[PDB]
Amino acid sequence: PMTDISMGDLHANALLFLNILVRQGIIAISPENYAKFAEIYTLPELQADYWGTEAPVFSAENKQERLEEIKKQYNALIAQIKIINTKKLIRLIGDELVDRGVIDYFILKLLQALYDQGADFEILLSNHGIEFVEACELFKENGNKLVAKRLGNIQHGNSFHALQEAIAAGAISNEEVLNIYHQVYKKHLKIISYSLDPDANEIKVFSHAGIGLNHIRGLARKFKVPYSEESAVDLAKTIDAINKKFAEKASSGEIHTLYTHDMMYRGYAGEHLNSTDEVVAATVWGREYGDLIRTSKKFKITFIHGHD
Numbered sequence: 001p002m003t004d005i006s007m008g009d010l011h012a013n014a015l016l017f018l019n020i021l022v023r024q025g026i027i028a029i030s031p032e033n034y035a036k037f038a039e040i041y042t043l044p045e046l047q048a049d050y051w052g053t054e055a056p057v058f059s060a061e062n063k064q065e066r067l068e069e070i071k072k073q074y075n076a077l078i079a080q081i082k083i084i085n086t087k088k089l090i091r092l093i094g095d096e097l098v099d100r101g102v103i104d105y106f107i108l109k110l111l112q113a114l115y116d117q118g119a120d121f122e123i124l125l126s127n128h129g130i131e132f133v134e135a136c137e138l139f140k141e142n143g144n145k146l147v148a149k150r151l152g153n154i155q156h157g158n159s160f161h162a163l164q165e166a167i168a169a170g171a172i173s174n175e176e177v178l179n180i181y182h183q184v185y186k187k188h189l190k191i192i193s194y195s196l197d198p199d200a201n202e203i204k205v206f207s208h209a210g211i212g213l214n215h216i217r218g219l220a221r222k223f224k225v226p227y228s229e230e231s232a233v234d235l236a237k238t239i240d241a242i243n244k245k246f247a248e249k250a251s252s253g254e255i256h257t258l259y260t261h262d263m264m265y266r267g268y269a270g271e272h273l274n275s276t277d278e279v280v281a282a283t284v285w286g287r288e289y290g291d292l293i294r295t296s297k298k299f300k301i302t303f304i305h306g307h308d
Helices: 014-023 033-043 063-078 104-116 127-135 157-166 174-188 213-221 231-253 262-268 274-283
Strands: 005-007 087-091 120-124 192-197 202-207 299-306
Touching: 005 014, 014 033, 014 087, 014 104, 014 231, 033 213, 063 104, 104 120, 104 174, 120 174, 127 157, 127 174, 127 262, 127 274, 157 174, 192 231, 202 231, 213 231, 213 274, 231 299, 274 299
Parallel strands: 005 087, 087 120, 202 299
Antiparallel strands: 192 202
């Protein structure tokens, strides 16, 4: 009923996420419940780098009790949030999980409420989000635990560490997290996305990091779909095909097969990722994939992405 919502990198800040959803007319929440939400979000016992590296709650003898009381009240607030706009599209440019914010549980519950009440949203694949994907996809492999040791070496994921510790303390269940992963999170994931104006032969391409047409061509090759750039409409059709193949990988629990960990170390380090098999790593890290192509004579394009 207005322009698409495009959110910057949230860094797992659930209150920032809430604020945008309220200010953009997606959700209604009372002022008193908003204040309760902000209070829970900034509880000293949940803040890392406050009295130690760890949030105080995780060194407390009664950590389970503390976390249970926070969790039940948090979920009571979620249950009082109403989605009031199901037509406005919400695009998350990424970093909604596994990042500097307090705990991934908070944004996971928000995503679940958005989905359950019919909001339209999409999540652009990021290096942070990919660690959550891998942890969930390899849950059984890792002995029924959410872990991602090698990916955790290249980025700070306080909010995911807090999730792991809360699960270890018995306050949050693997089954709840995994249900949200499979039922909510993974089917709203896109590698790249777009807004298309067919009459103007113009397209806006959205991605977590800086890419060009060369990345999209590499992705079409990686997923074995035809690449066409004969028009803005044709490029949109190509992007649809790329995301359809990606969703099949999401469904089979095989997103983690689209990269190797050496690609992610070199991605973090800032290197070129020019080999065809590295194109997913090159896209999420915004690294060189051959010559960067940002103009076509056959249509107008603007690229929209986050920064670092």
